[PDB]
Design a protein around this ligand. Structure first.
Ligand SMILES: COc1ccc(-c2cc[nH]n2)c(O)c1
Ligand SMILES: COc1ccc(-c2cc[nH]n2)c(O)c1
Lengths: 164, 164
């Protein structure tokens, strides 16, 4: 049992799907669990795909950088889609060390302890339209290190202040 | 010929060096070539290590996000260490698509077509002190895909405006 890695780019270079399509497809094909670590999450199309996964019964764990969490909240409000009322979705925040806000500068998407997308793509309009980025699609043994990291992050996460 | 990957964290988790020490060590041990793709580069200790590599005769190619390039220039000026007068160092900028500045959201360090550090760590004080991040140390076949990507980026880079 080794590790396999494909590179994807935005803009695309020698692969048929954009990074965003690949994300939406990875969410679409989730069977059991989605673990997401994201710095900024405002992309409505990716959000919808996640909500939909949850309604099929997939458990979804999301960890967001605390300092940008408001941009996610704003987006969920616009979508008339309160994350607290969705029973299969947990969302917690992670911060770094303050001095100036320390941040969780990590991002990745993990599905079913089977596939990871790891890279520089944030779930925002601007990464679809403006930014250059790259990700890895990872399968095999190294996905276990992404579980351990996700669990580790989750262990240090807080319930966002908005939730009473 | 496969690929090998180790994960490093900041803060450190089960490895002896911090990400910053590992960077400085990778630069220290460079023999021939350093290729760096960086979103923001203001860390004086990493800069010094690069200058020093260059004076030993290592060719250094740096690609920086255009929109943050001024922060690098400012730092080099403070250090009394003009990058244009250093014969072994080339620096070019890369931008994304504008609308709001599109950015090069990619970063990695490549040494000698042998080792890559790929991850969320930017070469700034704040990643040593405040931010949570992670990188991969990559060796083996996948390093060739980082050459191709670096060459591709380099092909799309511009001479910064400051250089006449
Ligand atoms: C906090 O604990 C968790 C929660 C979820 C996962 C996971 C795996 C694949 N998708 N989601 C995990 O690996 C650990
Ligand atoms: C723009 O062309 C280049 C320049 C430098 C490299 C390199 C390899 C290892 N370090 N630096 C490369 O792979 C392609």
């Amino acid at each position: 049992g080794g590790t396999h890695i494909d590179l994807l780019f935005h803009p695309p270079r020698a692969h048929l799907l954009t990074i965003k399509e690949t994300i939406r497809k990875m969410i679409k094909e989730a069977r059991k669990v989605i673990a997401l670590v994201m710095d900024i999450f405002t992309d409505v199309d990716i959000f919808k795909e996640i909500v939909e996964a949850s309604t099929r019964g997939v458990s979804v764990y999301i960890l967001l950088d605390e300092s940008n969490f408001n941009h996610f909240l704003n987006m969920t409000e616009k979508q008339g889609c309160s994350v607290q009322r969705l029973r299969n979705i947990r969302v917690r925040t992670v911060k770094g060390q303050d001095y100036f806000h320390g941040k969780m500068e990590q991002k990745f998407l993990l599905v079913d302890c089977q596939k990871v997308m790891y890279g520089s793509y944030s779930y925002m309009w601007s990464f679809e339209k403006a930014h250059l980025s790259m990700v890895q699609i990872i399968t095999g043994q190294l996905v276990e290190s992404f579980d351990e990291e996700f669990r580790t992050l989750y262990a240090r996460s807080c319930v966002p202040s908005s939730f009473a």
